[PDB]
């Protein structure tokens, strides 16, 4: 199941508008938007979330007319595994609860596997043999990633290629869902039919999703207890002291704490 909600996207003839429609649809299934803090929606709390509400599926197709279906965890927007035909593969979980939860995905698939690696960027970068800094994003990279995921089960994709493919999907789908800024970066690449690696503004934002989510949620009025350092496109560092500059940048936060009074507005 695969009775979880499914959102479809194809790279074939993809446009700025079709990509925007897709990311907006993904956000809509990740969270109801009923929990908002300082104008920014929060994903559902993992604690107490029923398994029938835990995942959504993204069915990706490309020009080669190959399809794969990614599973995303609504509590963190991240890719946890995928199905291609009669085989499904999952990142290695870190805890029993997550290991148990993924058994509820793709339950009719003939062949199920857990990868001998986790899906966090450190691990995927190590396997890929490159950092996010050197892995190009765009419609072209996504097209290739879909083919690579598709050919993995039959022995046709080596692990470093597979890891690179996951890094591409994760940033173009999960990180784009989490951040309007990164959705915008991907829109620009599609607009100009361009492939290019993410600059430091994107990578530091990705890394900081957790600490930004904590800083915003722990604030009564949106001012941070401690500033958080981000980077500009040219790599220079700056400090963020409150939520205001982040409202146009972050689309969704991971649940970190119950809302202090007034933090809902």
């Amino acid at each position, epitope marked *: 199941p695969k009775q979880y909600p499914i959102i479809n996207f194809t790279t074939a003839g993809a446009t700025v508008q079709s990509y925007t429609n897709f990311i907006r649809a993904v956000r809509g299934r990740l969270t109801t938007g009923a929990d908002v803090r300082h104008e920014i929606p929060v994903l559902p709390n*993992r604690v107490g979330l029923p398994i029938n509400q835990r995942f959504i599926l993204v069915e990706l197709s490309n020009h080669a007319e190959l399809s794969v279906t990614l599973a995303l*965890d609504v*509590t*963190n927007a*991240y890719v946890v595994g995928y199905r291609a035909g009669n085989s499904a593969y999952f990142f290695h979980p*870190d*805890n029993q609860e*997550d290991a148990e939860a993924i058994t509820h995905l793709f339950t009719d698939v003939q062949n199920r596997y857990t990868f001998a690696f*986790g*899906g*966090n*960027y*450190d*691990r995927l*970068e*190590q396997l890929a043999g490159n*950092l996010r800094e050197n892995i190009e994003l765009g419609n072209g990279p996504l097209e290739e990633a879909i083919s690579a995921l598709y050919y993995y089960s039959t022995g046709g994709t080596q692990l470093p290629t597979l890891a690179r493919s996951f890094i591409i999907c994760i940033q173009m789908i999960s990180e784009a869902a989490r951040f309007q800024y990164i959705e915008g970066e991907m829109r620009t690449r599609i607009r100009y039919n361009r492939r290019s690696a993410p600059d430091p503004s994107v990578i530091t934002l990705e*890394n*900081s*999703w*957790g*600490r930004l*989510s904590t800083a915003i949620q722990e604030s009564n009025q949106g001012a941070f207890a*401690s*500033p958080i*350092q981000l980077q500009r496109r040219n790599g220079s560092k700056f400090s963020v002291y409150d939520v205001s500059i982040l409202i146009p940048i972050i689309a969704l936060m*991971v649940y970190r704490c119950a809302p202090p009074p007034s933090s809902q507005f």
Partner: nanobody, 117 residues
């Protein structure tokens, strides 16, 4: 299972060396970075040097040349060798460990060690 950070090597010193060290224990699935920050009374907490996985060490301007960070990825230890210390470097020094957990990067902090110059 809970991450613990144990800091060593603080103390009193005078202008012109001192070495800090931190060892992490507990369930560590993926350590993205280990580093050292510092905070003086009446000032914000600030980065001194950080060693992110797979990348060059990142030093604050004031640490360039003077300080050297050293991370042992296998052992989850990080040390900071400081030379040419000034009174302006007086602060509480904190070890920072950044761990990927459930696909989110979480910060953890040592209890802090006083350095007085």
């Amino acid at each position: 299972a809970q991450l613990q950070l144990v800091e060593t090597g603080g103390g009193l010193v005078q202008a012109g060396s001192l070495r800090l060290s931190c060892a992490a224990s507990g369930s560590i699935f993926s350590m993205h970075a280990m580093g050292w920050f510092r905070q003086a009374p009446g000032r914000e907490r600030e980065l001194v040097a950080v060693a992110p996985t797979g990348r060059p060490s990142d030093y604050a301007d004031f640490a360039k040349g003077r300080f050297t960070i050293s991370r042992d990825n296998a052992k989850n230890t990080v040390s900071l060798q400081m030379h040419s210390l000034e009174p302006e470097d007086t602060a509480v020094y904190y070890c920072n460990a950044q761990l990927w957990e459930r696909y989110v990067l979480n910060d953890y902090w040592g209890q802090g060690t006083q350095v007085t110059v």
